[PDB]
Amino acid sequence: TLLINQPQYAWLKELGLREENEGVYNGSWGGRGEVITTYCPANNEPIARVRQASVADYEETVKKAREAWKIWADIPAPKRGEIVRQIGDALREKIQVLGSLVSLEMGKILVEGVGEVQEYVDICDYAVGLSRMIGGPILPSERSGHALIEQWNPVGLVGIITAFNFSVAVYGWNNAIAMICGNVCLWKGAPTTSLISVAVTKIIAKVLEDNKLPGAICSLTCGGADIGTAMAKDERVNLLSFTGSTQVGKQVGLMVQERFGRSLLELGGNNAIIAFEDADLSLVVPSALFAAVGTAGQRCTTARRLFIHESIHDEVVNRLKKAYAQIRVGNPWDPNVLYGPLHTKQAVSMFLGAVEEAKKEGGTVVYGGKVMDRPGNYVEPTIVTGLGHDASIAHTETFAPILYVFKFKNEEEVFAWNNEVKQGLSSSIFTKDLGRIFRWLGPKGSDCGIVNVNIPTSGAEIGGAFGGEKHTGGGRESGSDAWKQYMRRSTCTINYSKDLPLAQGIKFQ
Amino acid sequence: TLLINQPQYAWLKELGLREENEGVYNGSWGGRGEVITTYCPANNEPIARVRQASVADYEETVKKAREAWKIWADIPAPKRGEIVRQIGDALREKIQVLGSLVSLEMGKILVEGVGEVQEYVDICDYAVGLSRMIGGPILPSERSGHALIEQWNPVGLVGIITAFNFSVAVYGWNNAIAMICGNVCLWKGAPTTSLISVAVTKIIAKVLEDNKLPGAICSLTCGGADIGTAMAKDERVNLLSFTGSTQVGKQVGLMVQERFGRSLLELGGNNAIIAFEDADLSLVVPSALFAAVGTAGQRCTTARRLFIHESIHDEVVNRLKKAYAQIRVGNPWDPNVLYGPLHTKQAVSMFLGAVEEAKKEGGTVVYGGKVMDRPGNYVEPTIVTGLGHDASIAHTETFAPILYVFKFKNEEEVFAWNNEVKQGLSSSIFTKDLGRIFRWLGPKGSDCGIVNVNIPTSGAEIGGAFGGEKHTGGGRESGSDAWKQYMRRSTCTINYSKDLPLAQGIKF
Amino acid sequence: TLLINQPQYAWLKELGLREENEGVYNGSWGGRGEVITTYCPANNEPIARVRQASVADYEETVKKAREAWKIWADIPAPKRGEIVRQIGDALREKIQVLGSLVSLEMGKILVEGVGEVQEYVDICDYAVGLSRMIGGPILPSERSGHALIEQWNPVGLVGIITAFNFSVAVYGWNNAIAMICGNVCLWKGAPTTSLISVAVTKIIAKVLEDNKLPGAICSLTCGGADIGTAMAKDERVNLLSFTGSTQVGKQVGLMVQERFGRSLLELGGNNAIIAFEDADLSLVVPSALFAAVGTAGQRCTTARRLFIHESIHDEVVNRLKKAYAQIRVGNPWDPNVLYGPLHTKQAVSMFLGAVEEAKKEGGTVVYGGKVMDRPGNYVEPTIVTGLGHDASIAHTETFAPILYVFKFKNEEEVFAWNNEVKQGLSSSIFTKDLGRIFRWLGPKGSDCGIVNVNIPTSGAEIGGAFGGEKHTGGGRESGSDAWKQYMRRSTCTINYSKDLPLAQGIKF
Amino acid sequence: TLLINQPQYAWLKELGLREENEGVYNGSWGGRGEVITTYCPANNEPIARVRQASVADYEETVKKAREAWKIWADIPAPKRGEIVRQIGDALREKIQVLGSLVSLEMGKILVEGVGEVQEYVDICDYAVGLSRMIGGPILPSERSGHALIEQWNPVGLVGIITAFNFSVAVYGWNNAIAMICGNVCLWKGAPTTSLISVAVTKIIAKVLEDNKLPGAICSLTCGGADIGTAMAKDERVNLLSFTGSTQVGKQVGLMVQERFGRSLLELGGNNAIIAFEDADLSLVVPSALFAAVGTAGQRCTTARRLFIHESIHDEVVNRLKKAYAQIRVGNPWDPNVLYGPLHTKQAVSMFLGAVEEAKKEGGTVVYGGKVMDRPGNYVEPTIVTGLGHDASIAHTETFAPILYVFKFKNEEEVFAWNNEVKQGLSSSIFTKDLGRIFRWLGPKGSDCGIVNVNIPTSGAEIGGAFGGEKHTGGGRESGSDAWKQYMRRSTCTINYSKDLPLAQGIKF
Ligand SMILES: N[C@@H](CCCC(=O)O)C(=O)O
């Protein structure tokens, strides 16, 4: 009955998955907690079983991870980079079967699932060179015979808590950067993506073991909210990188702050696209479609608000409706499929209430709005007109493919409206006006961490830092100097002279 | 009876201070809150009075500041830097008399009063060049016809809460850096240094108004915990830089995180000096003395733990005694005075309490330990030997000049003892050994934000970033790229090409 | 008969100038070369005299600067920045009178002459903060127990050769940066701006002396080609920064190369403005006018080629013409004057000769062309239409206010036409097309060092690096990491571990 | 009779090598020039043949690389990095055979041949991440409505001329970096390592072909001096990276400077190790030997001068004689050999002349000095004592394993003696003294590009920039921000507003 027992999914064994899999890795495999069965969201069938971490399994893994950091922190960064280079190779070798699992257990289409593995591969290749670059400047001291040096050192144990929607890429950014920076990692993923977590962990575990490194450098404790809470409350977890809901993340932030820990928070988005009157509509319509319906509207960067200038509102909405009607729906791993299921049945329920709540706040469904009558967690991609930009349902983040559309007239109000929500992840304007683009990029422009021009809200690459402002939680991942979040800075002054001159010219005798 | 009314203290008027001073500034001066009188700790006499912020004053000040920000954010950063350059010059012209006020109301000696003002002068000169510099890389996008740029923009309103012990320098770092970064500022100082806040604000306000700029760019609301708590809970304060105790820092951190604000935390220190058997003892002894007794032991970077290798312990303690006994004690504004009073009478009592608790836990007062028999808040700089490095009184930061001295034997144990406490601000070892030095700077070395070699734990320069790890709160100020904390990063992709994404089967 | 002896020019004494001035400074003032007279190009009247450097003067000055470097290089860079801050202040207090000297001896209008002093002031402000920042990274070694750090150290003696047209700003970018970088400087300016060189040097000398530093840190040796050639051949000149013609800089570049020195060459320009059909013409015409006739067209960044899309070629030419006929000509120090004289009498012959050659090559003079019938080296600002874009006269750099106007149709060809010249200094396009702008900035866009959009080719700011490509020599001055050209990089690996090398079979 | 025709060398065919090979690659393979046979320095047996480039081949190849550049420079940098990554993989896969060919044709030991290829693999992995990072800052303009951006674009065609000794690593450093930076490459290697060039080029071509990229992106034209001179004078070669002798490099710099090109010069070294009295002799003796005898003393980083403090000179020399006696000499593929032959018989004759000259100049040969009695270019590693530190032969860079030993007493003189030679590549001190070490790294320390502590003069890592000062030519390769030499900077100002404010506030 389990998909992994059927001959058509024999490919799952290419990842080393079996019937029932150990969900805890710390150099050894195990798991004394509850056994969980994950399901294919396209057809509600069970895939395989994962043994979750008990509290004793969590405890022993933290201790072994900390034992392993002592070895790992002594490995020169570029040699740590070499390990990350081999992780990238191992991922590359299995990119098609691993992306296939992502489509199967999580539900995004195959191009996006292989693309998610490619991000992990790409951030590995990026971290290899960065492992020869991380550090600070040597600075000119004002004091004779003194050296002034900025040093960076690992923070220790990096806990990484991931959500269902990027069960691979988010861990990848975190793991590749944390590791070249000399940290050990502990991973607790979403329970509905446990097999993905195990399959990735197996890939990394073999690379550590092939290099005779302690496996707990990249530990795994599959589990639910109690393992996540324990990590937030645990003083041995020096940095906690949490990706998830704003609601749960706020509590994670408070528990880490209570113990003077470090948190890296990637929380909810309520991302706006703005199309001005001079916008290229050949760019607006398909950009908005991909950004809205891509991954069935379940990215943190999904376009959820569409502001259109008064003069072109109707035309964009009509053209958007024409294009929605051609979205090809089916199993996420079949060719030509563009749109698959939601990840859980609860997500369908949240979708339905969102749509009803938008009707009750005076919105009009111009496209979609219904559960699709088919096996799996499938809902129609939905467009809502007529809500005021300050409608409660438009300010709520709903992880479902609902696009609230608004009119506007001038730039100043619509910039404000982009900025008025609690979230602050991604944002995008479509315009040709040079002055407006640099204003959008300026202090009176977009307040988000991602600020795009003539591309949708899901336009990001690993070269820059990834994260948001306000209720998105402030953290950054991937590129630029985001590695500094995974290390502690020391300002170091070395008197190599025989004298003791004091800063700011203070004479003390 | 008020010091400001006696002719020998007429110089306070050079700072614009009067008998009763307004404690709120937001373009205009006011203060409808509680009136307090601050006192000179060298003689327990009242100096002058400050009318503090009421709630309505606070409300009006935040509103005015956020309005001023709309103007200030539109000023090009280099021109903002020119304003900060004039603030530099305006502190330069007042450095002697402002430093005397710091000596009079806070109580540190004159060279440290002027040196603290010199730090604000220094960070101003630094920020002027930085104002032509702040920003991010243009990065190579992986997409044809796309630009990738990292932009930095101001967070808006920077609230600044400071403590009594560095009533000028801390605000100075935060103010100069926040200003060039395009933010407006709201300052709440320690009530016992309210005259210092007012005088500093007067200097800034004049520069602002001389440049026909709204003075709320650098607002002041004098007040106690109610004002500080209001700032920590106020969503209009985008960044709260808080320097203070660890207990209150933790509550401010939680309040800011509750509202998804930004906090910058600079909390307590329990800093250690370690002296290895190979150390130049002529660097060790005066470094320890200055780091210990400087500012009467009231810096967050004060050395409170002295680890000496077993082989040189007694000689170093004996040499430190001989040096403690030669310290010149007096009024802190008198030149050539080296040792002033504690900031309050409570601190004198808390000093005696810790000496007693030290003795109870088995320590020996080898020097000092007693209040001095003179007017003011004077206690003897104290050296305790014989405690275990884990004794509880030595793990509780007490703003009093008590230096706890421990023995050690080997590198590894004393590195761990340095790291064992809750705080993580400054640290220093004294050694000639090349490998030990780099290990101290490495991942198995010191865990503090300031990691020093052959100098005391105190007296950092402004070119590097300042702050601590662990219970010190993790914030940074002053140098390096600490400015990034005062701004918001954005990663910006610009599609400048006429290319449409693949139709992916949809007829458009 | 000297202007400095007339009552109205008595303001010259505020700069310490006299009838005859020493043109050598190395801590002492001297000069045993030929005495030269400088003339005011506004009326061809002699201003005053300067004694130039003999061979002996040059030798003694180099030795003294090389001795001063021993002291200066040991001064911490942030303290070297404090000196530069004071130079900036000394220039601030003299900006009106020094700018007036620039107008009187060089001949640009007063706002540009003051604005040129401003640039030196600005780069000082910048350099102060830069003196806290310069350095390189500490990198992770792949070797256990090893440090990898990039050190920067001064090159030693920076020869600075400048031209007549920016007799203050160019020296200042070089000076403020070389100084904070730990170098000593030797200046040889243009002979016809000797008083400016002497006056700048007096301002800097006072600061140095006031700070009890050897004056040779900023040495001056006024002289002609013999001194400049000596510097290019002198192994004691570790870096030679040369701003001048392409023909001379090429020989300077080879002489420095022949002795394995470092050189920084800022040579000619042939800068183009390209206005596309969608350009804001209210931006195009005033931008073109300023860039072409500002400084009487004697800037290295002056616009000399103006490409206009054939749809708007005549309209732009007509509006530009009516705009030319409204320029206020007169004495450059008189108010509201926007167009002063050429710098030399010889420059007027080159202008007349270029105009005829332009007519010779088929171009039509649609405005100007003639010498103005008045005292001084006054020529009419000129506009020439009808040349092929590749006319020989339009590819030669001529320091005259002649604008060569061309038509174009396609973006590809006109980008190529911008790039086809030998020089690669400045360039500007005027358009609203987002894609064309980023293509202009990209690998198939401008090949110049300054690449502008909707602003003239002249008037950069200090935050960025300044300089050109191709026959402009490749040097960079002022901003970004231009400072690195004044320092030598070292890549330093420190073994601090007691680990011994792999014996590899040998018994040690 | 050719080694590639013998069964024991059949591994050569795994590199695509045949009896007669084409020495030109530009997308197609060819070679109309002279046919050269390269020989094995271990036994003077012919390996294979290569058809060198005619001038027509060079001419055709430049045109193809320039056309290929139009395509390559349009490809985003991170995608260019993806090519380089595959090149590292294709090298990684062939490391043993390519290492073995390096040992066979050049003559170094197999572990060093393999290690030289690892450097290329390493710089590939480094450049891949660099491909997402290159660029400049976005700076805050002093002007409202204005953007300030620093851009970097490729230079175009980067000609790479290498010498025999690092026939793979140097090319790789220049190639990986120039490629991610959007340039195309044309390689002329040393004729005596033509097979190495063809083999490396075959490996790269396959990667380019599989990625459907024009092969001329990595062009090769095997040839002698006439081809190198062509590149030095060729305006279409935008950057010429030249590794080789100072004599030729000086001429290369002059030719490139004459045409206003860009040159990157990596010339000779006369590197010193200094062992102070406090040095760990357990570190000094092996570090000296491997730095002096490694690669038969044919590195540019080879230790040629050993300064020893008087107190320890005799001991170190005696321990270094007893260590030289254990160097295992044999064929460079023989397992467990440390020391192979010199590259040419002319290197043998230079060696002999240097020894005899050192003897005729007063030195004593305490070890070696003679040619070995076996087939190949084998000479005893040599140690010369009693020679004054400025003896003429000591300052001559002779590319052979001779180590000149000198005594010293004081830190200052021996630093001066390190710095007194014309070359400025690598330098090393062995000491435990902390103050001495930072002085060595400071402005009065080593003048070299590479400044090491307690490690030998060779063996730096790709993370840092590599190159020297003075007569070493100033170029930097590989790490840090060396990539900037392969790109042109542009300072770009964008006015996105309808206003036009001039810099420095100049009102026109
Ligand atoms: N510049 C001073 C600042 C101390 C600040 C503090 O004690 O809270 C120092 O480095 O000790």
Radius of gyration of chain D (CA): 24
CB within 8 Å of B214: residues ≥ 6 apart: B27, B64, B67, B68, B71, B72, B208
D257, C260 Cβ separation under 8 angstroms: no
Tokens of B424: 């993580």
> Is 3.40.605.10 the CATH classification of the domain at A1-268+462-509?
yes
Enumerate the β-bridge partners of residue B147: B494
Are C262 and C239 in contact by the 8 Å Cβ rule? The answer is yes
Class of domain D1-268+462-508: alpha beta
Interface of D with C in 289-318 (CB under 8 A): 289-290
Q: Is A266 a catalytic residue?
A: yes
Question: Any chain A CB within 8 A of the CB of C441?
Answer: no
> What sections of D262-410 are H helices per DSSP?
281-293, 310-324, 345-360, 392-395
> Cα(C336)–Cα(D372) distance, rounded to whole angstroms?
87
Q: How determined?
A: X-ray
- Tell whether B397 is in a known binding site: yes
Q: Any chain C CB within 8 A of the CB of B88?
A: no
Are residues D137 and B133, on separate chains, in Cβ contact within 8 Å? yes
CA atoms of C365 and C362, how far apart (whole Å): 10
Residues of B annotated catalytic, as ranges: 266, 300
- Say whether B85 and C479 touch across the interface (CB within 8 A): no
Q: Which residues contact B456 (CB under 8 A, 6 or more apart)?
A: B273, B287, B288, B290, B291, B303, B428
**Please, what sign has the CA dihedral across residues B201, B207, B209, B215?**
negative
User: Integer distance in angstroms from the first to the last C-alpha of chain D?
Assistant: 82
- Residue ranges of the domains in chain B? 1-268+462-508, 269-461
* CA–CA separation, B394 and B383 (whole Å): 12
The CA radius of gyration of chain A, in Å to the nearest whole number, is 24
Taking contacts as CB-CB distances below 8 angstroms, the residues of chain A near B455 are: 146, 493, 495, 500
| Interstrand relation of D426-430 and D450-453 (parallel, antiparallel or unpaired) | parallel
Helix (H, G, I), strand (E, B) or coil at D119: helix
Tokens 């040690």 belong to which residue?
A: C508
Which residues of chain B lie closer than 8 angstroms to C494, CB-CB? Answer: 434, 438
Do C51 and C24 contact (CB within 8 A), yes or no? Answer: yes
Question: Given an 8 Å threshold on Cβ–Cβ distance, is D127 in contact with A129?
Answer: yes
Place of tokens 């690996």: C493
Beta strand pairing call for A157-161 and A184-188: parallel
The CATH number given to D269-461 is: 3.40.309.10
**DSSP state for residue B379 in the 8-state scheme:** B
Q: Which residue of D has its CA nearest to B454?
A: D434
Helices (H), B48-140: 55-73, 77-93, 95-101, 110-130
Using DSSP, state whether C480 is helix, strand or coil.
coil
For residues D466 and D436, the answer to whether their CB atoms sit within 8 Å is no
Q: Where are the beta strands (DSSP E) in A194-313?
A: 218-221, 239-243, 262-266, 271-275, 303-309
Closest CA to C181 of D485, D443, D452: D443
> What amino acid is encoded at A400 in this protein?
A
- Other C-beta atoms closer than 10 Å to the C-beta of B409 total 11
| CA A146/CA A499 separation, integer angstroms | 10
Picking from C51, C195, C333, the residue whose alpha carbon sits closest to that of residue C203 is C195
Which of left, alpha, beta for B228 (phi over 0: left; psi -120 to 50: alpha)? alpha
Measure CA B491 to chain center.
Answer: 32
Distance CA B11, CA B100 (A): 9
CA angle D407, D409, D410 (to 5 degrees): 130
The verdict on D323 touching C (C-beta cutoff 8 Å) is yes
D20 is catalytic: no
For A99, the 3-state DSSP assignment is helix
Token pair, residue D271, equals: 């590197």
Alpha-carbon Rg for chain C, nearest whole angstrom, is: 24
Angle A110-130/D110-130 helices, nearest 10 degrees? Answer: 120
Task: Give the DSSP H or E segment for C437.
Answer: helix C434-441
- CA A507, CA D300: separation in Å to the nearest integer? 50
Q: Identify from B276, B278, B434 which residue to disrupt to test chain D contact, counting D C-beta atoms within 10 A and taking the largest count.
A: B434
Tell me the nearest-neighbour CA distance from D283 into chain C, angstroms.
5
Residue found by looking up tokens 């698959």 in the block = A340
Residue C91 and residue B334: Cα distance in Å, rounded?
37
Distance, CA of B296 to CA of B347 (rounded, Å): 11
Contact status of B444 with chain A (Cβ, < 8 Å): yes
Please tell me the distance from the alpha carbon of residue C339 to that of residue C331, in angstroms, as a whole number: 8
Strand partners, A22: A51
Q: How far away, in angstroms, is D422 Cα from ligand 1 center?
A: 48
Resolution in angstroms comes to 2.0
Question: CA-to-CA distance for B230 and B250, rounded, in angstroms?
Answer: 15
Alpha carbon B102 to chain centroid distance? 14
What residue owns the CA closest to ligand 1's atom 8?
A: B300
Which residues have any ligand 1 atom within 6 Å of their CB?
A: B 119, 165-166, 169, 299-301, 458-460
Q: How many residues does chain A have?
A: 509
Residue A1, classified by CB atoms within 10 Å of its CB into exposed (0-12), middle (13-18) or buried (19+), is exposed
Contact A162, A173 (CB under 8 A): no
Q: What six digits make up the tokens of B102?
A: 């710091």
d(CA C472, CA D260): 8
